[PDB]
Design a protein around this ligand. Structure first.
Ligand SMILES: Nc1ncnc2c1[nH]c(=O)n2[C@H]1C[C@H](O)[C@@H](COP(=O)(O)OP(=O)(O)O)O1
Ligand SMILES: Nc1ncnc2c1[nH]c(=O)n2[C@H]1C[C@H](O)[C@@H](COP(=O)(O)OP(=O)(O)O)O1
Ligand SMILES: [Mn+2]
Ligand SMILES: [Mn+2]
Ligand SMILES: [Mn+2]
Ligand SMILES: [Mn+2]
Ligand SMILES: [Mn+2]
Lengths: 196, 195
């Protein structure tokens, strides 16, 4: 049969992340357990946050994917990721994506498409996001000189990479800089390559 | 310029632990962060692997082999690339082929392998190797794939046309409540965005 959540007991709770004990029934009817992770910041939204796939489009250039580089404490190092952020209450994933993109990179984009809620690491947490594809007219004078404005302690570096050579360019950065590329970013790059 | 200063254990379970991370920001200011780690870490190249299995048969569309299973943290079923932990002394490529065979019964060949990539850098230190594996669906070996599941592992196999992956993923989501993995969806998106 199907599997069902029986109960969810809180183990420990921080200000942002909480650890839980999940009791559930497997197909055979046997009671199993699991140690699940959940954020405390989510309330009544469609997902925790969004990830933005910013496609920089310019008349004189190949399409580029705008990525960001920042220090991630949980990783204890710098990571290369799609721009990403939380969805504000009453805010749509699309609106969150456009704002987040501008805040982190300074680019002003347009919605190309928006995904349903997708899971970040189902074996670990309940964390989900909306993947929002956003196009940026790099030729518009407004996007000629992108000027971001991070919040308090963000410190974000912007890195644009050619769509037609994304994977190789990511590999280079990993070897030279000792960075860690995001799994979504790399999955994206792999498909671009496999499609040719 | 930024680095880790210290880490204080907040709560450790048998599988997962939560801790407070103090680090130095670019200004020289001290800040903290709540980070998640699996209670099992070592001198590996990554925590585990995720396999992108490309089922190839002559005169047929390529298919992407995915797995569907109940995920307690999500409290529901998810669609993911086959995945699992890497064993001691085992290469990422080796764990991929083994993991794929265990979950799908398919015996494939290594196409390429990524460096260690982060699963959710804003939350945890979890990393994996994304391994692209081609499966000769015409070879006798792969005529009748026999999955060899471990205890407590209940995995359903799904093969979707690579040429129409995104749309087929949506069709599944439309049929019933389930969540597509972000890595799988990112892959499906790029297939459409390509040139
Ligand atoms: N009770 C538990 N609580 C939390 N994590 C657990 C767990 N039991 C358990 O195995 N894990 C870990 C093990 C894995 O890191 C992960 C399960 O996801 P995967 O990698 O697809 O599983 P795999 O195929 O079995 O190796 O959760
Ligand atoms: N001290 C802390 N510990 C843990 N998580 C934290 C945190 N402070 C904090 O903001 N978070 C959460 C908030 C978010 O879930 C995430 C911050 O990173 P992102 O995804 O890029 O979000 P953004 O900064 O809003 O754009 O971690
Ligand atoms: Mn951010
Ligand atoms: Mn934000
Ligand atoms: Mn941000
Ligand atoms: Mn698995
Ligand atoms: Mn497994």
């Amino acid at each position: 049969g199907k599997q069902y959540i029986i109960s969810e007991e809180l183990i420990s709770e921080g200000k942002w992340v909480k650890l839980e004990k999940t009791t559930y029934m497997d197909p055979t009817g046997k009671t199993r357990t699991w140690e699940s992770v959940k954020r405390t910041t989510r309330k009544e939204q469609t997902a925790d946050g969004v990830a933005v796939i910013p496609v920089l489009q310019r008349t004189l250039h190949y399409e580029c994917i705008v990525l960001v580089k920042q220090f991630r404490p949980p990783m204890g190092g710098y990571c290369i990721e799609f721009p990403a952020g939380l969805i504000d209450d009453g805010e749509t994933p699309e609106a969150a994506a456009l704002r987040e993109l501008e805040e982190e990179t300074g680019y002003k984009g347009d919605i190309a498409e928006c995904s349903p809620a997708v899971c970040m690491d189902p074996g670990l947490s309940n964390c989900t996001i909306h993947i929002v594809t956003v196009t940026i007219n790099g030729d518009d004078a407004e996007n000629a000189r992108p000027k971001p404005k991070p919040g308090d302690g963000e410190f974000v570096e912007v890195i644009s990479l050619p769509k037609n050579d994304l994977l190789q360019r990511l590999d280079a950065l990993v070897a030279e800089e000792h960075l860690t590329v995001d799994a979504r970013v790399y999955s994206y790059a792999l498909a671009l390559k496999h499609a040719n």
